[PDB]
Amino acid sequence: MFENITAAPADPILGLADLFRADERPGKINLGIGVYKDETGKTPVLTSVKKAEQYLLENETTKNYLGIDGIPEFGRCTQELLFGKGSALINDKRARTAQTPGGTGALRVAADFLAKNTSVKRVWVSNPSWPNHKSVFNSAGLEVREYAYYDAENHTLDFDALINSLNEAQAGDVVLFHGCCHNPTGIDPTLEQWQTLAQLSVEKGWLPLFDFAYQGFARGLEEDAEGLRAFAAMHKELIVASSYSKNFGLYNERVGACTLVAADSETVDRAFSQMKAAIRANYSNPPAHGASVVATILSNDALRAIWEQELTDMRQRIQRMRQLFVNTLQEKGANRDFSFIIKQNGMFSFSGLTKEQVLRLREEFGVYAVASGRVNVAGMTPDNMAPLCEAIVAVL
Amino acid sequence: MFENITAAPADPILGLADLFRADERPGKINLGIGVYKDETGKTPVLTSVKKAEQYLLENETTKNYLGIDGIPEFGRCTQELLFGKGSALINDKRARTAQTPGGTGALRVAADFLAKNTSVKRVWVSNPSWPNHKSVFNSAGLEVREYAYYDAENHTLDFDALINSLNEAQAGDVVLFHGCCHNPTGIDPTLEQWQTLAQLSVEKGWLPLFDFAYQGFARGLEEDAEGLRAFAAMHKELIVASSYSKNFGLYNERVGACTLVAADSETVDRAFSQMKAAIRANYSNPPAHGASVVATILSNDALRAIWEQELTDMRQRIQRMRQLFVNTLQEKGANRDFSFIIKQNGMFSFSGLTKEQVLRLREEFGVYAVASGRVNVAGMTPDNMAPLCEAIVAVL
Ligand SMILES: *Cc1c(COP(=O)(O)O)cnc(C)c1O
Numbered sequence A, B: 001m002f003e004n005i006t007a008a009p010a011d012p013i014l015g016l017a018d019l020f021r022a023d024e025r026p027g028k029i030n031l032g033i034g035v036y037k038d039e040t041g042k043t044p045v046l047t048s049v050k051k052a053e054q055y056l057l058e059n060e061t062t063k064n065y066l067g068i069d070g071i072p073e074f075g076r077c078t079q080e081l082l083f084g085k086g087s088a089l090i091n092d093k094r095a096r097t098a099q100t101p102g103g104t105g106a107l108r109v110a111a112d113f114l115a116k117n118t119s120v121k122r123v124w125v126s127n128p129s130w131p132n133h134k135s136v137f138n139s140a141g142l143e144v145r146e147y148a149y150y151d152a153e154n155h156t157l158d159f160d161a162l163i164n165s166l167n168e169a170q171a172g173d174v175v176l177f178h179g180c181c182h183n184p185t186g187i188d189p190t191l192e193q194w195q196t197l198a199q200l201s202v203e204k205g206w207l208p209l210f211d212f213a214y215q216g217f218a219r220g221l222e223e224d225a226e227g228l229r230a231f232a233a234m235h236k237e238l239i240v241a242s243s244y245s246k247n248f249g250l251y252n253e254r255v256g257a258c259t260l261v262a263a264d265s266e267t268v269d270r271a272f273s274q275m276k277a278a279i280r281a282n283y284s285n286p287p288a289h290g291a292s293v294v295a296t297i298l299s300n301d302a303l304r305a306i307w308e309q310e311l312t313d314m315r316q317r318i319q320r321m322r323q324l325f326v327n328t329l330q331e332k333g334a335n336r337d338f339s340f341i342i343k344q345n346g347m348f349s350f351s352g353l354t355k356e357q358v359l360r361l362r363e364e365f366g367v368y369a370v371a372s373g374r375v376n377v378a379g380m381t382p383d384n385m386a387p388l389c390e391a392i393v394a395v396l
């Protein structure tokens, strides 16, 4: 039965973590996966997290199954993070959140849900976009077309091209947006551009799906949600797949949520009962640990002040590696001008490095960037900044 | 978009948990859902687990993404649980194991893998069988037919009726078997009967798919897998969705594994690469906490000895409750003979109660059992044994 199965191509992102491993070059540099590293090159467990964990070890008395939808406080606390405190969607009881294994898991459950309870045929994901969007949507059976986004010549948001390409979008289609910190570009629409986009999906009839995976990493917890919010204000229906992987440094615990907002309480309640049926058909119920942690941290005023501090240190440290990179790049000989990198938000900059330049960096210099030229700035430290900028310049 | 979504029926097992967590009657008895309960009426966190957990808190330095397939030693410790330390599938590098969100997460990825990389079109699940088998397979795209199993008259395995029913399955079809502790009948094949099904399966070209969710609740760790080991010796290929939910009391942490065996390593390698592709499109990578706990325990001689003692305590308390149940039943003057209940194994008993007795039993006596007459003998306590046998005896 398995004899003619062909081998699957390694993940463009997750595949790098593999090569880097089997690579023995002593001074190798990993700028691939979107995991935060500190000044010393480690991905530390946040303090607020270790504290929450102590608390759980002491106070947990059962492992008993959570419910299809997970921990209630988790959902409740994530909607205030998403929508705001004393928000219309929350008072009206328009929304329902299921806890899922990471934001990928949210994406998929949203996919299987739509494919199965709606007349949804296709989803629009930006160009470029996180490579895995394509794969989860096709797995549920949805077609994914693409809308223009990045202007590679001026390294900006091509608003027109975005708008004009979206016109081929039918009423009833899903249009996927990135809450903030566009992966891979890091170029986000402004608030006015968000509102403009909020008003069009309402007139054109699309159902927005937000991939919120970097809340906190651009400007601030609240600021980062303006776009999603400008939208929730005008939309009757919405889907939000958010992740706690990056902002809680909780990567392998798998914490995310799929938030379903409808016109009203009874509808959303009804819509949501099918989502739970899909989750039951998939992984049954979610992993308790990471979600309990996030819940513990968000529901305790002290733990939460600490966490907010830690997140703010991650954000800011990344903003220092951005400005250090262009400098060292211009200090070291850079032919081109990489200053547009400073205008990008999040762990990533789209370098504008050619697939042969990235292949060379990896091969000749052990420097690992992704084939598109997306480099993880948070993977850069003041001790590897010099060897990095010399590898890149010797390949331009 | 959501206005037309029909509300979904509650899960026949998981929804029960809610109807229960909702009637404010005082002496209400939940006998529906497979969580273990001790003499005091709760599902405590096992002590080997609290210990492994402390170790993790002290010892973890990072929450960085695991690999799509999870933790190596986890996979490696699972295979020896399944096949046997020594075992040819291990030394010939014939199996590959992926860490998954529970046995339900295993079953689903095997379904998604089978449906997209093979020509499998239908799968055979016994009658009766875990109600969720059908929803999982159907979600992947597969059709599920049924093979005879339970003889409701004599409360046994209707061997020839199962064998005659399976003779309608074609070469290239998936036939799902339960490793031990048939859910919900508790009737399991004999080793002789396992061989016969092993040989016949090999002759009819079926692909065996084992759901092993109770290793250790029947006779013991090693002896519960005999049936499974009987097929592995004769087959080139087979898959195993195994759970650690019940036997490690890690129910909400979601720990299980999908084990893929092929004729040889080059093949299983190639096969597995697509199984990793199906996972990446689903949840991305597995939750670390509980598989790190299981790994720690199986790796450590002290922790493993303690955990094994805990398992044999649960198993034995259950075998105590099943003898106490048919006796007190026999003492409160139950019209019927319920002696077969002793004959079955694992957490459950197929009571033989009609849909209406079990509905009466709950509205009227707060005794919660699954509509099929399935009762969790492990939710029985010497305190609640008297009131429950009087509820049962009064509806028959
Ligand atoms: C990281 C990320 C995801 C995946 O989050 P996980 O929780 O790791 O599964 C999805 N979308 C975007 C835009 C991301 O950055």
Ligand SMILES: *Cc1c(COP(=O)(O)O)cnc(C)c1O
Binding pocket: A284, B034, B101, B102, B103, B104, B105, B130, B178, B183, B211, B213, B243, B244, B245, B254, B255, B256
């Ligand atoms: C419990 C069970 C499963 C599920 O294992 P989980 O880890 O809880 O998903 C699968 N099959 C059977 C027969 C079970 O009893």
